[PDB]
Design a protein around this ligand. Structure first.
Ligand SMILES: *[C@@H]1O[C@H](CO[C@@H]2O[C@@H](C)[C@@H](O)[C@@H](O)[C@@H]2O)[C@@H](O[C@@H]2O[C@H](CO)[C@@H](O[C@@H]3O[C@H](CO[C@H]4O[C@H](CO)[C@@H](O)[C@H](O)[C@@H]4O)[C@@H](O)[C@H](O[C@H]4O[C@H](CO)[C@@H](O)[C@H](O)[C@@H]4O)[C@@H]3O)[C@H](O)[C@H]2NC(C)=O)[C@H](O)[C@H]1NC(C)=O
Ligand SMILES: *[C@@H]1O[C@H](CO)[C@@H](O[C@@H]2O[C@H](CO)[C@@H](O[C@@H]3O[C@H](CO[C@H]4O[C@H](CO)[C@@H](O)[C@H](O)[C@@H]4O)[C@@H](O)[C@H](O[C@H]4O[C@H](CO)[C@@H](O)[C@H](O)[C@@H]4O)[C@@H]3O)[C@H](O)[C@H]2NC(C)=O)[C@H](O)[C@H]1NC(C)=O
Ligand SMILES: *[C@@H]1O[C@H](CO)[C@@H](O[C@@H]2O[C@H](CO)[C@@H](O[C@@H]3O[C@H](CO[C@H]4O[C@H](CO)[C@@H](O)[C@H](O)[C@@H]4O)[C@@H](O)[C@H](O)[C@@H]3O)[C@H](O)[C@H]2NC(C)=O)[C@H](O)[C@H]1NC(C)=O
Ligand SMILES: *[C@@H]1O[C@H](CO)[C@@H](O[C@@H]2O[C@H](CO)[C@@H](O[C@@H]3O[C@H](CO)[C@@H](O)[C@H](O)[C@@H]3O)[C@H](O)[C@H]2NC(C)=O)[C@H](O)[C@H]1NC(C)=O
Ligand SMILES: *[C@@H]1O[C@H](CO)[C@@H](O[C@@H]2O[C@H](CO)[C@@H](O[C@@H]3O[C@H](CO)[C@@H](O)[C@H](O)[C@@H]3O)[C@H](O)[C@H]2NC(C)=O)[C@H](O)[C@H]1NC(C)=O
Ligand SMILES: *[C@@H]1O[C@H](CO)[C@@H](O[C@@H]2O[C@H](CO)[C@@H](O[C@@H]3O[C@H](CO)[C@@H](O)[C@H](O)[C@@H]3O)[C@H](O)[C@H]2NC(C)=O)[C@H](O)[C@H]1NC(C)=O
Ligand SMILES: *[C@@H]1O[C@H](CO)[C@@H](O[C@@H]2O[C@H](CO)[C@@H](O[C@@H]3O[C@H](CO)[C@@H](O)[C@H](O)[C@@H]3O)[C@H](O)[C@H]2NC(C)=O)[C@H](O)[C@H]1NC(C)=O
Ligand SMILES: *[C@@H]1O[C@H](CO)[C@@H](O[C@@H]2O[C@H](CO)[C@@H](O)[C@H](O)[C@H]2NC(C)=O)[C@H](O)[C@H]1NC(C)=O
Ligand SMILES: *[C@@H]1O[C@H](CO)[C@@H](O[C@@H]2O[C@H](CO)[C@@H](O)[C@H](O)[C@H]2NC(C)=O)[C@H](O)[C@H]1NC(C)=O
Ligand SMILES: *[C@@H]1O[C@H](CO)[C@@H](O)[C@H](O)[C@H]1NC(C)=O
Ligand SMILES: *[C@@H]1O[C@H](CO)[C@@H](O)[C@H](O)[C@H]1NC(C)=O
Ligand SMILES: *[C@@H]1O[C@H](CO)[C@@H](O)[C@H](O)[C@H]1NC(C)=O
Ligand SMILES: *[C@@H]1O[C@H](CO)[C@@H](O)[C@H](O)[C@H]1NC(C)=O
Ligand SMILES: [Cl-]
Ligand SMILES: [Zn+2]
Length: 1201
């Protein structure tokens, strides 16, 4: 056994300890030299061959430490603390620390290999997508780069969790075993636990207490910065993920561990316009090279009259990426061979301003070694383990200053711009101030572990609690005791303390302030440099010269003047950013800190399936531009043919239209598929947000081509079936739905013929639709689900943008029941005297085939049988219009006048030349359903009506003009939003401007009626005529879409379609079928919009909200008294009240426009009840005159045969 490796015999005396120590020093540096030599070789020449040597030399070192430690611990430990000279005690104490070696060999292997496994797992940790990806991501570059570079919350979250999953989960069991052995080993050394040993290095009886006091003094700076970043992150990600008062999601801070916020500087940079001064471009033109960069650095130290580099340095240092091309650990490091004769830097230098500063840092280490190289090896270390880095840093700060750069010559003028330095200082603030709490809590956490304050069942609980309490962060996902996120940070599984850095950071600024004060410098500390200040160099040298001989605190007191750490120097360095940030925080009213800490974000909508979705908003903006630009042409093209065909039925126009139909199909699918690639939930431009959400709906196109084909096939089969069904008399005479059968329903008073027509249409048209409905439902439900809805019912109901729709609709309907019930009963009485009790039960629901309409959706056809007062007309308005020479254009002209008096946009000139106001006489065939058309060209707007000169068409004209008016004033929005606030609004506006038309006042104002006796009966007569549609149509319109909703809900099946229909027909319309019906019939097929699969609830909304608007206009127009006597005419303000609302188009939720119009954000039936209040009174009264009893409790009655 080499005497140079094993201690000899020594007494327990100080002289013996001195002789032992002296002997230890001589051999120790020899051993260390061998160890580092191979270390340098492998690190400088990466190969398994050198790895083997490194492994061997390190092994030898341990045996040496074991031999000497063994003797030292045995010899002096009973007396060592009494040795007079602390110098000796320091040396002996270090060697006397055996650590792991204390463990028995079996535990040694377990402990040593265990540590190796912990290290292996961390570096081996791989994160893989939930796909059989060809290659996964490792911690770096992939995971760190993607996490540092990506800004997609979903993507960023997945990477953050995966790393914690792979790294944390497997470490949790192992780390416990380390805890037992680690504490067990140090127990033999004499420390209560691993934590006590690490804290022992700082020789501070109140060390941990000191740090909390330090941290509390820095918290004011940290909170201000935390609030500022919190605000900035909120600007980027939105309140959904950033609670202005709560903690910040750990994964959004730009780095896997949130230990450094540098990567978010691009979002927060003050004065973004001032460029960061980079001297690299000049450095290159200066011909500088890495080798000279270091000699430049050496000159700085010579300016400090410190020791220049030994020639050994120029020879040994691995300044560059070696020309030999052999592999090397390019990460810049400074190496000190304990051989007093040499020290080396390994830079792998590349010419950048950053590396220039880096080199100065590393050289500072070299300078530090040189100054204490004279001390014994045991003392040739920092005053405290954090002390080392600080010295290197303070040197790094001074040179980074542009003042210093100018002194070097790399800058022509030192522009003293506060915006520049604030931008710079803020970058440094994000780089390291954000680090302070993190570095503190990790070792705060570990002491809890080693002390047992955090038992195993709390590894993760205390981790997040501590991480949240100090750093102000919460997890991106709820995490529980199964996890061990502590294993996610390199320093944990590698069991390397973190506290050194935090203390080092405070010492850095603490030293810096001292030298600046020593250098006679004044003013801004961040503008200080120590260059050329020999007096300060001597002070710095003093601190280095002592090395680890003198206790760090003693040296610090001599340097700066204070026996302990303090935050004051650090704050003064950042004073400027401190002041500035508070104002930025003050102006935003930020809540310093994070109350309501128990808050955290929701998971992404499709996590983890949506983690690769594109969230960049700049391209989405351009996307919307191209979409509008292209969609305008396609819809206009579509509209052109669609208009051309609707007026010119010529068969070839249909062929043309079909081809155009394919184009919109092409376009819809093309841009729809592209739209689905944008992730809307992360966007913040509200306009773009709604636009993309809409376009993302692919409707039928979400179905597979085969099923889409099958779906369209079925639609046409149903559409065709309805299109060709007819009812035929026994003689074979066949009647069509319109106008033929409609006239029967409208004109017949014969119970037999009405039933035959109603029954017949339902028998041939109705029953047949069951040939397709079931699969039809299944298919559209499949499509709805593929579009992200629960079912087709959810899909349609979603267009009202309000989840409580059905509840609101329900309440709205209930509020009309008193009126509807009175009307219902009154009509029943009218039917009673014409069809008799044998067919009319005055105490039950009404036979659904007598309401004058094939579907009983509108009762206006029976007005003659229900009129409350005859002698209603003072003049025939039809003959009067004829007498006054009224023409279709004159009719629409009067409407434009009304609209002009209301200050709304006049109709464009081309309208008068391309609209079709009359039945063509050139043999063209027209689709006569009156409607209004928008060509999306900001100039083409047209009306198509088979205009007849009568009052009815006069209402149609205004109604159509209403739509036109609505198109014109939102023409400025992009096509994607050229829609009403909601489906109802568009159809609702149509009535509002028309309502006044039929009032007696407006009727008379145009002399359509000569003066009439001012009877209320004429008002009542008009109001009932209105109610006979406005009211009756409400419940029917409600029932259809509810019936479909519950069918889309799957809650209703074919076995009872008929029963659910009639049950609803009873509950909502108070109706029953005229004759019993069994399965095989499917009455709902009897109404077009069902087999045509078109929603109806819009009409209901239209007939409600239109009355709120009318009241608002009458209120704004100043009208008082009976609401039906209101006349909007020429109200310059009332028009403007609507104008501002219409311009919103579909860009806003309808509650905004609703309020902007009426002053309320909710739909309210009260306006309508008020409108009909007089008629209700009369009808209610009439019920008393006849003693009519309201309701239909006696469900089962039908007309007698
Ligand atoms: C890294 O940089 C080193 C520093 O180079 C200096 O700084 C850079 C930014 C340039 O400005 C460069 O021109 C500077 O020299 C660099 O070392 C330098 O390498 C250059 C060539 O690349 C050498 O140039 C020659 O210099 C001599 C004069 O220098 C000697 O004498 C003076 C005293 O007079 C001493 O102070 C010096 O230390 C040297 O001992 C010139 O006489 C010689 O002239 C030749 O070229 C001219 C035409 O230009 C002809 O007319 C002559 O007849 C000769 O043919 C060169 O100009 C320079 O000596 C050297 N300086 C030092 C201090 O070593 C180093 O090579 C770089 N390393 C890498 C890896 O890039
Ligand atoms: C920890 O252990 C190491 C190794 O034992 C000690 O390192 C020795 O340190 C001493 C100085 O403390 C060094 O002595 C120097 O020797 C130089 C001559 O070296 C040649 O000659 C010797 C034999 O005399 C050979 O062994 C050697 O290989 C060379 O061939 C001198 O030139 C030096 O001069 C300096 O010191 C003298 C006073 O001694 C002054 O008068 C001079 O002006 C000058 O300042 C010096 O004498 C010795 O070389 C080191 N050994 C090794 C192997 O490097 C550490 O000292 C010890 N730690 C402590 C705290 O003692
Ligand atoms: C309803 O829509 C229909 C389809 O758009 C219109 O039908 C067109 O009616 C015109 C007459 O009104 C017919 O004119 C004939 O066209 C053929 C072929 O013309 C083509 O070739 C010549 C060169 O030889 C070219 O100059 C033309 O532009 C055409 O490209 C001639 O041979 C005849 O002499 C006559 O001019 C069209 O044929 C006919 N087209 C179609 C597709 O049916 C109809 O006019 C519309 N009705 C209204 C009232 O607008
Ligand atoms: C330090 O001093 C101790 C004594 O205080 C030395 O220990 C002795 O080491 C020798 C061998 O180097 C041992 O010799 C053997 O002794 C036994 C009887 O004890 C004898 O039968 C054998 O034939 C052999 O000679 C001796 O046992 C051992 N003594 C004790 C008490 O362990 C040690 O060598 C000294 N080391 C140095 C570096 O000075
Ligand atoms: C980097 O590391 C590798 C491996 O540690 C070194 O490779 C070894 O280099 C030596 C010479 O430097 C080789 O030995 C010599 O090879 C020549 C040519 O065959 C022969 O003429 C000599 O007599 C002697 O055998 C050795 O084979 C080679 N490989 C190994 C495994 O040792 C490499 O030199 C290192 N480079 C640096 C810059 O440190
Ligand atoms: C560090 O991790 C390695 C790898 O997990 C551990 O090595 C493994 O150690 C176990 C026993 O400690 C060996 O178990 C044997 O496995 C074979 C199947 O491979 C089985 O047939 C035997 O009955 C037995 O269970 C295992 O072979 C061995 N693997 C290797 C590659 O050597 C090591 O023990 C871990 N050390 C610590 C301290 O956690
Ligand atoms: C702690 O919380 C974690 C989640 O944060 C819990 O682990 C999770 O447990 C569920 C099932 O309980 C796992 O999901 C299931 O996976 C199976 C396939 O293994 C699948 O068939 C199921 O449909 C379901 O998706 C989930 O993957 C798992 N996640 C993790 C990260 O382990 C754990 O149970 C909680 N433990 C305690 C004590 O609170
Ligand atoms: C949201 O994005 C839309 C779409 O680009 C922006 O609309 C632009 O508005 C300016 C005037 O404000 C017009 O000059 C542009 O023509 C509009 N864009 C297009 C494509 O026409 C809108 O300003 C954005 N709003 C917010 C709050 O981000
Ligand atoms: C088939 O028979 C019915 C029943 O006789 C005919 O319907 C009548 O048509 C006339 C006008 O053509 C009406 O005035 C009657 O009121 C209808 N009666 C009924 C009960 O509806 C029908 O016209 C006959 N068709 C043919 C082609 O002979
Ligand atoms: C010296 O030893 C005595 C007796 O064990 C003890 O009371 C005293 O505290 C020791 N001195 C030091 C500095 O530990
Ligand atoms: C920059 O200007 C400020 C003005 O308040 C001054 O305090 C500071 O000393 C100036 N710095 C330099 C380097 O001129
Ligand atoms: C449009 O649809 C037709 C259908 O056959 C197809 O042939 C054509 O390639 C499509 N074009 C685009 C751009 O989608
Ligand atoms: C309408 O057409 C006539 C020709 O029939 C033309 O004189 C007039 O200028 C056209 N007006 C507009 C607005 O196009
Ligand atoms: Cl709808
Ligand atoms: Zn360093």
């Amino acid at each position: 056994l080499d005497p140079g490796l094993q201690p000899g015999n020594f007494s327990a005396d100080e002289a013996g300890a001195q002789l032992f120590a002296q002997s230890y020093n001589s051999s120790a540096e020899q051993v260390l030299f061998q160890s580092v030599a191979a270390s340098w070789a492998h690190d400088t020449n990466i190969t398994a061959e050198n790895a083997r040597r490194q492994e061997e030399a390190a092994l030898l070192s341990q045996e040496f430490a074991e031999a000497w430690g063994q003797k030292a611990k045995e010899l002096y430990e009973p007396i060592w603390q009494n040795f007079t000279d602390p110098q000796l005690r320091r040396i002996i104490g270090a060697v006397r620390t055996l650590g792991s070696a204390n463990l028995p060999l079996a535990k040694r292997q377990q402990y040593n290999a265990l540590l190796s496994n912990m290290s292996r797992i961390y570096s081996t940790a791989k994160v893989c997508l939930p796909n059989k990806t060809a290659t996964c991501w490792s911690l770096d570059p992939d995971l760190t780069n993607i996490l540092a570079s990506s800004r997609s919350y979903a993507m960023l979250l997945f990477a953050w969790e995966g790393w914690h999953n792979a790294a944390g989960i497997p470490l949790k069991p192992l780390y416990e075993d380390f805890t037992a052995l680690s504490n067990e080993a140090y127990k033999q050394d004499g420390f209560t636990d691993t934590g006590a040993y690490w804290r022992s290095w700082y020789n501070s009886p109140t060390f941990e207490d000191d740090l909390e006091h330090l941290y509390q003094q820095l918290e004011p700076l940290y909170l201000n910065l935390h609030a500022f970043v919190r605000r900035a992150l909120h600007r980027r990600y939105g309140d959904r993920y950033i609670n202005l008062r709560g903690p910040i999601p750990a994964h959004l801070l730009g780095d896997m561990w949130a230990q450094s916020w540098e990567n978010i500087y691009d979002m927060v940079v003050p004065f973004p316009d001032k460029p960061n001064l980079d001297v690299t471009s000049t450095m290159l033109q200066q011909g500088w090279n890495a080798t000279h960069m270091f000699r430049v650095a050496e000159e700085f130290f010579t300016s400090l009259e410190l020791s220049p580099m030994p020639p050994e340095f120029w020879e040994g240092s691995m300044l560059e990426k070696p020309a030999d091309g052999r592999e090397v650990v390019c990460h810049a490091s400074a190496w000190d061979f304990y051989n007093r004769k040499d020290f080396r830097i390994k830079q792998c230098t590349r010419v950048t301003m950053d590396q220039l500063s880096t080199v100065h840092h590393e050289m500072g280490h070299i300078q530090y070694y040189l100054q204490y190289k004279d001390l014994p090896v045991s003392l040739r270390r920092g005053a405290n383990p954090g002390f080392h880095e600080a010295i290197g840093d303070v040197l790094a700060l001074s040179v980074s200053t542009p003042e210093h750069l100018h002194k070097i010559g790399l800058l022509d003028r030192v522009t003293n711009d506060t915006e520049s330095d604030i931008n710079y200082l803020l970058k440094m603030a994000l780089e390291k101030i954000a680090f302070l709490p993190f570095g503190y809590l990790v070792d705060q956490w570990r002491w809890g572990v080693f002390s047992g304050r955090t038992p195993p069942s709390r590894y993760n609980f205390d981790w997040w609690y501590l991480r949240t309490k100090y750093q102000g962060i919460c997890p991106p996902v709820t995490r529980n005791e199964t996890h061990f996120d502590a294993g996610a940070k390199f320093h944990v599984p590698n069991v390397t303390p973190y506290i050194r850095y935090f203390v080092s950071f405070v010492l850095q600024f603490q030293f810096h302030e001292a030298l600046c004060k020593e250098a006679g410098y004044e003013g801004p500390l961040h503008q200080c440099d120590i260059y050329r200040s020999t007096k300060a160099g001597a002070k710095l040298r003093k601190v280095l010269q002592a090395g680890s001989s003198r206790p760090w605190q003693e040296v610090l007191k001599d340097m700066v003047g204070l026996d302990a750490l303090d935050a004051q120097p650090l704050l003064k360095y950042f004073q400027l950013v401190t002041q500035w940030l508070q104002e930025q925080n003050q102006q935003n009213g930020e809540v310093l800190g994070w109350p309501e800490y128990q808050w955290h974000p929701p998971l992404p909508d499709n996590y983890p399936e949506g983690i690769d979705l594109v969230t960049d908003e700049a391209e989405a903006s351009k996307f919307v531009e191209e979409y509008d630009r292209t969609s305008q042409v396609v819809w206009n093209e579509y509209a052109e043919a669609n208009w051309n065909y609707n007026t010119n039925i010529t068969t070839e126009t249909s062929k043309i239209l079909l081809q155009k139909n394919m184009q919109i199909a092409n376009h819809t699918l093309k841009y729809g598929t592209q739209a689905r690639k944008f992730d809307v939930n992360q966007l913040q431009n509200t306009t773009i947000k709604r636009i993309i959400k809409k376009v993302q709906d692919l409707e039928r196109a979400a179905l597979p081509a085969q099923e889409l084909e099958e779906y369209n096939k079925i639609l046409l089969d149903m559409e065709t079936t309805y299109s060709v069904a007819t009812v035929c008399h026994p003689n074979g005479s066949c009647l069509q739905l319109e106008p033929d059968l409609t006239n029967v329903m409208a004109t017949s008073r014969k119970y037999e013929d009405l039933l035959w027509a109603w029954e017949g249409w339902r028998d041939k048209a109705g029953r047949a639709i069951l040939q397709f409905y079931p699969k039809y439902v299944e298919l559209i439900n499949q499509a709805a689900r593929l579009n992200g809805y629960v079912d087709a019912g959810d899909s349609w109901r979603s267009m009202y943008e309000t989840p409580s729709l059905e509840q609101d609709l329900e309440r709205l309907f209930q509020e009309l029941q008193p009126l509807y019930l009175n009307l219902h009963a009154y009509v029943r009485r009218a039917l009673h005297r014409h069809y008799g009790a044998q067919h009319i039960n005055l105490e039950g629901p009404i036979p659904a085939h007598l309401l004058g309409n094939m579907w009983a959706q509108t009762w206006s056809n029976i007005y003659d049988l229900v009129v409350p007062f005859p002698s209603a007309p003072s003049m025939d308005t039809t003959e009067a219009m004829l007498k006054q020479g009224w023409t279709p254009r004159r009719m629409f002209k009067e409407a434009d006048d009304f609209f002009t008096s209301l200050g709304l946009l006049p109709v464009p000139p081309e309208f008068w030349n391309k609209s079709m106001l009359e039945k063509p006489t050139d043999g063209r065939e027209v689709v006569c359903h009156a409607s209004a058309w928008d060509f999306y060209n900001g100039k083409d707007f047209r009306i198509k009506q088979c205009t007849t000169v009568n009052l009815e068409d006069l209402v149609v004209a205004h109604h159509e003009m209403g739509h036109i008016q609505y198109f014109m004033q939102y023409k400025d929005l992009p096509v994607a939003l050229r829609e009403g606030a909601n489906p109802g609004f568009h159809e609702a506006i149509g009535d509002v401007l028309a309502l006044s038309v039929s009032t007696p006042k407006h009727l008379h104002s145009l002399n359509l009626l000569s003066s009439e006796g001012g009877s209320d009966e004429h008002d009542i007569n008009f109001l009932m005529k209105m109610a006979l549609d406005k009211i009756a149509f409400i419940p029917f319109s409600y029932l259809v879409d509810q019936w479909r909703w519950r069918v889309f809900d799957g809650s209703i099946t074919k076995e009872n379609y008929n029963q659910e229909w009639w049950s609803l027909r009873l509950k909502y319309q108070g109706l029953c079928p005229p004759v019993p019906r069994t399965q095989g019939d499917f009455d709902p097929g009897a109404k077009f919009h069902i087999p045509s699969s078109v929603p109806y609830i819009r009409y209901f909304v239209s007939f409600i909200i239109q009355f709120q608007f009318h009241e608002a206009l009458c209120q704004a127009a100043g009208h008082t008294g009976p609401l039906h006597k209101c006349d909007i005419y020429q109200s310059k303000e009332a028009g403007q009240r609507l104008a501002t609302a219409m311009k919103l188009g579909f860009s806003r939720p309808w509650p905004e426009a609703m309020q902007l119009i009426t002053g309320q954000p909710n739909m309210s039936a009260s306006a309508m009840l008020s409108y009909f209040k007089p008629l209700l009174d009369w009808l209610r009264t009439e019920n008393e005159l006849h003693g009519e009893k309201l309701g239909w409790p006696q469900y089962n009655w039908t007309p007698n045969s």
